[PDB]
Amino acid sequence: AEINIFSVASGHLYERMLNIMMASVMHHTNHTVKFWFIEQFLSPSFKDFIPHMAAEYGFKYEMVTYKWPHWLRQQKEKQREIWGYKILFLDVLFPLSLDKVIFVDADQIVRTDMYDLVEHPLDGAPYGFAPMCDSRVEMEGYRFWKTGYWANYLKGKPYHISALYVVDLQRFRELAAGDRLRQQYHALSADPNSLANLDQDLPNHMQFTIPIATLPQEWLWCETWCSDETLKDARTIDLCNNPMTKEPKLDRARRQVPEWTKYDEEIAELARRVRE
Ligand SMILES: O=c1ccn([C@@H]2O[C@H](COP(=O)(O)OP(=O)(O)O[C@H]3O[C@H](CO)[C@@H](O)[C@H](O)[C@H]3O)[C@@H](O)[C@H]2O)c(=O)[nH]1
Ligand SMILES: *[C@@H]1O[C@H](CO)[C@@H](O)[C@H](O)[C@H]1NC(C)=O
Ligand SMILES: [Ca+2]
């Protein structure tokens, strides 16, 4: 397909949002789309419904089942294992014939033609991530990356959010990025205090040697970090956790994104159509 997106979802709530993410992508593009799923975390009901979504929204899809290598340090916490699947196996999850894939979070709402990210220049980087917003000034106390360890490590480089990222698989394979990320993760994870945010900390840690193309800030907006004024420019939205309010996930979705209920109700209408 012209646009290839992968995502990971574990739980009924994240599968419900994953269907919404997919409908939002297809409402904003006429280019061909293929969705790739990390199979082992999904429910039987989701896997049964995905051909119905595919036929209604007009996309292709594929399930990838990749076993965690025995040598590689395992993660006992399911959340951390799922983070490992986002970042450690980018060279082995997809076929050698696929040249590019984008990770889009299951809780995202897309408001752009995702082919614009496929066409974005990476200047030789094997992947691109958006930076964490600095625009919501009242949240500065929670930007852990602006002081301590990260401020000294980064030397003014951005601390990137891992909700969305484009992977040029040809370049990623040319650089042996997959083998190098697995080895650094294995060494660093011997310390259980390292890589607190595994999927996010690992590429940010490796960005002096596995380059990151810093994407336009508009590629990823999250209310927690980003101003209300920049929402209108946002290409995609992440429903990231707000450590100050601790607002529930579905409340954030309905309150922030006016079209969320429309996609949710449309997918539920498709489900009642297939059921009868
Ligand atoms: O498929 C999923 C994803 C998350 N959770 C749980 O939901 C809670 C909160 O996680 P989540 O909704 O993923 O937090 P976000 O704030 O959305 O996550 C942000 O920060 C994470 C790194 O900390 C990145 O992986 C995400 O892409 C980014 O959106 C945790 O208990 C997770 O285990 C699930 O049950 N299933
Ligand atoms: C898809 O094609 C139709 C053709 O009339 C056009 O109106 C619509 O804007 C196109 N959408 C995108 C995202 O290109
Ligand atoms: Ca998220």
UniProtKB/TrEMBL annotation:
UDP-alpha-D-glucose binds at residues 10, 14, 79, 83, 86, 105, 199, 238, 241, 249. It comes from the Eukaryota. UDP binds at residues 10, 14, 241, 249. It is found in: Endoplasmic reticulum lumen. Disulfide bonds join 133-226, 222-240. Residues 3-270 form the Glucosyltransferase 24 catalytic domain. Glycans are attached at residue 30. Ca(2+) binds at residues 105, 107, 238-239. Belongs to the glycosyltransferase 8 family. This is UDP-glucose-glycoprotein glucosyltransferase-like protein. It comes from Chaetomium thermophilum (strain DSM 1495 / CBS 144.50 / IMI 039719) (Thermochaetoides thermophila).
